[PDB]
Amino acid sequence: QEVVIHKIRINLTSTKVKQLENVSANIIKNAETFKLVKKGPVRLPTKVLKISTRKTPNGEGSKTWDTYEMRIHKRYIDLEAPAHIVKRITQITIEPGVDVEVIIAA
Amino acid sequence: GRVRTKTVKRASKALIEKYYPKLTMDFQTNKRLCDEIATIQSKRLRNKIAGYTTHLMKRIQKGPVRG
Amino acid sequence: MLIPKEDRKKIYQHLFQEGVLVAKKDFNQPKHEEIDTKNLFVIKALQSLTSKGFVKTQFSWQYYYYTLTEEGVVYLREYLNLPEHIFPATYLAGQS
Amino acid sequence: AIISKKRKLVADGVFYAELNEFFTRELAEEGYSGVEVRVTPTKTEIIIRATKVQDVVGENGRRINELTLLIEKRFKYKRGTIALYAERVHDRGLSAVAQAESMKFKLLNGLAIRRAAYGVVRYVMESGAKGCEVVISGKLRAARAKSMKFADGFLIHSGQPVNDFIETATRHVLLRQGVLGIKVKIMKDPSRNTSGPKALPDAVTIIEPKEEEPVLEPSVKDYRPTE
RNA sequence: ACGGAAGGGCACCACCAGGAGUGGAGCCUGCGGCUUAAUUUGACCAACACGGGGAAACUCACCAGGUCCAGACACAAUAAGGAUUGACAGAUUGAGAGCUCUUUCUUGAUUUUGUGGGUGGUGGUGCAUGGCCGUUCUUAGUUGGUGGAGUGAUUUGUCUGCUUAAUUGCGAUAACGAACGAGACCUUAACCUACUAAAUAGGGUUGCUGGCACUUGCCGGUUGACUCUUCUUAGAGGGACUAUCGGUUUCAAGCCGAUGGAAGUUUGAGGCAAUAACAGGUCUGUGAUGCCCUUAGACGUUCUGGGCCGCACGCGCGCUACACUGACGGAGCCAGCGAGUACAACCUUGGCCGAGAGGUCUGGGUAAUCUUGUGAAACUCCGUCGUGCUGGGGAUAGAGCAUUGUAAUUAUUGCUCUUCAACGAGGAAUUCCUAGUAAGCGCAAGUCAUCAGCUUGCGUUGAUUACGUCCCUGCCCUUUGUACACACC
Ligand SMILES: [Mg+2]
Ligand SMILES: [Mg+2]
Ligand SMILES: [Mg+2]
Ligand SMILES: [Mg+2]
Ligand SMILES: [Mg+2]
Ligand SMILES: [Mg+2]
Ligand SMILES: [Mg+2]
Ligand SMILES: [Mg+2]
Ligand SMILES: [Mg+2]
Ligand SMILES: [Mg+2]
Ligand SMILES: [Mg+2]
Ligand SMILES: [Mg+2]
Ligand SMILES: [Mg+2]
Ligand SMILES: [Mg+2]
Ligand SMILES: [Mg+2]
Ligand SMILES: [Mg+2]
Ligand SMILES: [Mg+2]
Ligand SMILES: [Mg+2]
Ligand SMILES: [Mg+2]
Ligand SMILES: [Mg+2]
Ligand SMILES: [Mg+2]
Ligand SMILES: [Mg+2]
Ligand SMILES: [Mg+2]
Ligand SMILES: [Mg+2]
Ligand SMILES: [Mg+2]
Ligand SMILES: [Mg+2]
Ligand SMILES: [Mg+2]
Ligand SMILES: [Mg+2]
Ligand SMILES: [Mg+2]
Ligand SMILES: [Mg+2]
Ligand SMILES: [Mg+2]
Ligand SMILES: [Mg+2]
């Protein structure tokens, strides 16, 4: 008796791209397989996590710096979909690196 | 300062020596041929290879050449 | 170290009961966590036991990893005078 | 647990650094190679790739268990929510960490420096590697410092091919007169390097053309018409 | 290796033509010297706004003092009629320190005093070491296998030429095949009316409204609906390869020009970046570390206060200025990098107070959602000033109001009123830089409880003059000479 739509939301994170895109594509394919209405894998600006650091551990040497960084890609998805199939989708197809989070928002 | 170092020249030479009947005068057709008949990893190297292949083909069309 | 015997008793009983400790290197802190006593003599008592040859220590990123060897188990069992058929939580076969 | 997502990823990275350095400290005698941290909806699986898997597990599977316990206290986890897993290295020759630790161990037993280094290089190229290199720096049988290089095959140095194929390892060895520094570099076979490109950037492969016969001039080979 | 020897090529850490400067002034900061109890220390192109070194406590390493053992373990030794521990109150102390004493009370084998040993050390040695980074060297340079020449150290391959940013190629050849470097490669910046899509981004139509017009239209508001992805995003891809053409080239590598392009400097900018080496720096980043030193009134650790900021003086990065292309008033109103609270208290809107700093009450934001369209400065328009060290310049001081802070004096910092100094475009000399570049202008992030005149990034306005050379300073290859090899110091 879970016919009430939860208008659920699936958001993602990672420091990589191919695995995150793969997980999103599998999520969309699973949603399409059971006739689910959705808003697509909307892309979010890749947040560049940057730290500048001096290379010399002792200050001696010509002034030389470096910039380490990652990017975080988010690609949230929301579904106007039934209950059990959505949750089963969330607990399946999980890849290390990409982090899945689910918000009911009902 | 474009000199087209060893790799592109040698690859184009082998491309001509093994596939002259299929190569043409046009850059784009030879680019597609380079894509399909040879596994160039990147695409900038692919474009350079196709360009030098076209240049060598034009030189051959003008006349016979060394090497 | 001068540890009052009841705090040392707590150290020993927790250590034998479950076998492992972390004991942040930061001294002078009020209470060590899941022990309700000062971290300082926790570290010192574990150092004394290691010097005896009962606890293997491993320092990495200030967290003083501690583990009990078999002679340590025997010594703790004799000190805590507990029956000789109970093993620390590590020995429990919590396998796959 | 609510925290900024960028900070959460930074914490995940520093936690992986935590685990890797702690396992390097502990399982060094085990020929430790690497650690993978997989996160499931319920369990935080921690796969340990090491050489002596059976000793890593220990008798009756107790050692792994106690190791697990330490983690549950190092990060304030909960029982069952985290679980270790020991796995044999796919090929101990290719991994730089295992070779560096093994030849550090061989140095610890007073084995000849040149002999150990050359044996390591020989084994690495026996494993199928496309090139190995070892730098041993320090007080090699002299008070003055000196660095010995033992290389075989070819090792690239520029471009992410440095990151993609050749893997490096740095270790310190304590002796009775000082510290020796060990750098080990291996350029794996690009054709066998899965999960990425399978060749160098300038590696060009040309498909050999197929040979055919042209003489058939008229050759109107009629098929059965269909409608 | 060097040559005030030759050949051929390069470099705004070289110059020519220039631009902006510094060096003159005041100040901030970093060194030296002096001074001091200490003014802790390491660096002297490749030291000097460097050690992330913007230190009031901590930091800390120095100084005057006061605590404690955080001396494991083994043995001996005392010792359960006390090995020992701790303390109210007073003297003592800076202390509400049982540190030391007066008295006494408490505590139970953990300890106490000796031996061995072990730890701790921002103690010494970077001329014992690792790791890292810097430099030689941003140049194009290295290397070994067979083969040739040498008795040999070595040499040829690695070169007569031309070309390239390139040991980049065309080639000639006792050289043939190869390896590292360069290139290739990744990140980033462009171009995508082609694909996928979007209430955490925008747009259209239409609602429901506001106003002005009265013609159906203009500028708005609404998280009401339908629809779309051009811009904003980010994935897969496309695109440029010197493409076409014309010159010039043993007609080959390649160069020059025009056209089409978005892009024709390797498309711009970077990230990695070879062999060999320095007695280059770092023990002061490391629980990296050998040796030496110390390890009890300690060079361990902690507490209080002071210093790292003193000042007859010299030097190095910079900041504000010397004004009219300006200062000061109003008004216009334009960004892109960021960042932001949990076991803590961050970014702050909005409403009230105060003249301001600021204060208070609420509300958002764990982030394309909220600060935020960061409504930033330079800039623009209209006025006051009018060549007067003047309304420039804002240093040095006096008084007061607040904020952070356990604590602000030796002014932390912000704000209000006043005194307003030197400074007239700065000698010798010297620094950086050829296109969204220099320069001007600010903002964000790292330091951060509070503090930048610093650095790392970002964007605004945006040029003059080259598009060359070996004259100065050097670099690469070749030839030559050398009585040099710790190599012209
Ligand atoms: Mg290469
Ligand atoms: Mg490269
Ligand atoms: Mg100069
Ligand atoms: Mg000049
Ligand atoms: Mg100036
Ligand atoms: Mg001056
Ligand atoms: Mg001066
Ligand atoms: Mg001084
Ligand atoms: Mg230089
Ligand atoms: Mg200060
Ligand atoms: Mg102090
Ligand atoms: Mg201090
Ligand atoms: Mg003192
Ligand atoms: Mg120390
Ligand atoms: Mg040195
Ligand atoms: Mg180099
Ligand atoms: Mg020979
Ligand atoms: Mg030679
Ligand atoms: Mg579009
Ligand atoms: Mg032509
Ligand atoms: Mg480039
Ligand atoms: Mg030391
Ligand atoms: Mg000290
Ligand atoms: Mg100072
Ligand atoms: Mg400087
Ligand atoms: Mg004025
Ligand atoms: Mg903006
Ligand atoms: Mg005046
Ligand atoms: Mg600074
Ligand atoms: Mg030039
Ligand atoms: Mg001589
Ligand atoms: Mg002389």
Residue of A nearest to D42 (CA): A91
Topology of domain B1-61, per CATH?
Diphtheria Toxin Repressor; domain 2 (1.10.60)
3-state percent breakdown (helix, strand, coil) of chain A, nearest 5: 20, 30, 45
From the number of C-beta atoms within 10 Å of its C-beta (0-12, 13-18, 19+), residue A60 rates as: exposed
Q: What is the CATH superfamily name and number for domain D91-223?
A: Ribosomal protein S3, C-terminal domain (3.30.1140.32)
Give the count of beta carbons closer than 10 Å to the beta carbon of residue C4.
Answer: 9
Which 155-174 positions of D have CB less than 7 A from strand E? 155-162, 170, 172, 174
**β-bridge partners, A66:** A53
Nucleotide nearest to D11 (CA to C1'): E366
Structure tokens at C69: 């060897």
* Number of folded domains that form chain C: 1
Cβ distance D74 to C67 less than 8 Å, yes or no, reads no
Give the CA C84 to C1' E453 distance in Å: 74
Does residue A88 reach within 7 angstroms of strand E, measured from its CB? no
Tell me how the structure was determined. cryo-EM
**β-bridge partners, D179:** D174
Q: How many Å lie between the centroid of ligand 22 and the Cα of residue D165? A: 39
* Number of folded domains that form chain A: 1
In chain D the first and final C-alpha atoms are separated, in Å, by 70
Cβ distance D38 to A90 less than 8 Å, yes or no, reads no
For the domain spanning D1-90, the CATH number is: 3.30.300.20
Annotated domain spans of chain B: 1-61
Residues 6+ apart with CB under 8 A from D100: D169, D170, D171, D182, D184
* Beta sheet of D146-153, edge-to-edge order: D146-153, D131-138, D179-187, D166-174
C-beta separation of A10 from A71 below 8 A: no
Structure tokens at D226: 């269909």
Chain C partners of D69 at a C-beta cutoff of 8 Å?
18-20, 89-90
Q: How many Å lie between the centroid of ligand 31 and the Cα of residue A33? A: 87
Alpha-carbon torsion, ordered D154, D155, D160, D163, to 10 deg: 120
**Rounded Cα gap, residues D21 and D16, in angstroms:** 9
CATH (domain of C38): 1.10.10.10
Rounded to 10 deg, the angle between the D62-74 and D5-26 helix axes is 140
Nucleotide nearest to C58 (CA to C1'): E287
Give the CA A58 to C1' E307 distance in Å: 24
**Range(s) of the domain holding residue A75:** 1-106
Which chain E positions come under 7 Å from a protein C-beta?
A: 42-43, 45-48, 50-52, 69-74, 85, 108-112, 128-135, 163-166, 168-171, 179-186, 188, 196-200, 233-236, 238-244, 252-255, 265-267, 271-277, 279-282, 284-285, 287-291, 337-343, 366-368, 455-457
Alpha-carbon torsion, ordered B18, B23, B27, B32, to 10 deg: -80
Structure tokens at D163: 């990151």
Residue of D nearest to C61 (CA): D18
**Range(s) of the domain holding residue C10:** 1-96
Which ligand is closest to the CA of B59, given by its number?
A: 20
CATH (domain of A36): 3.30.70.600
**β-bridge partners, D146:** D138
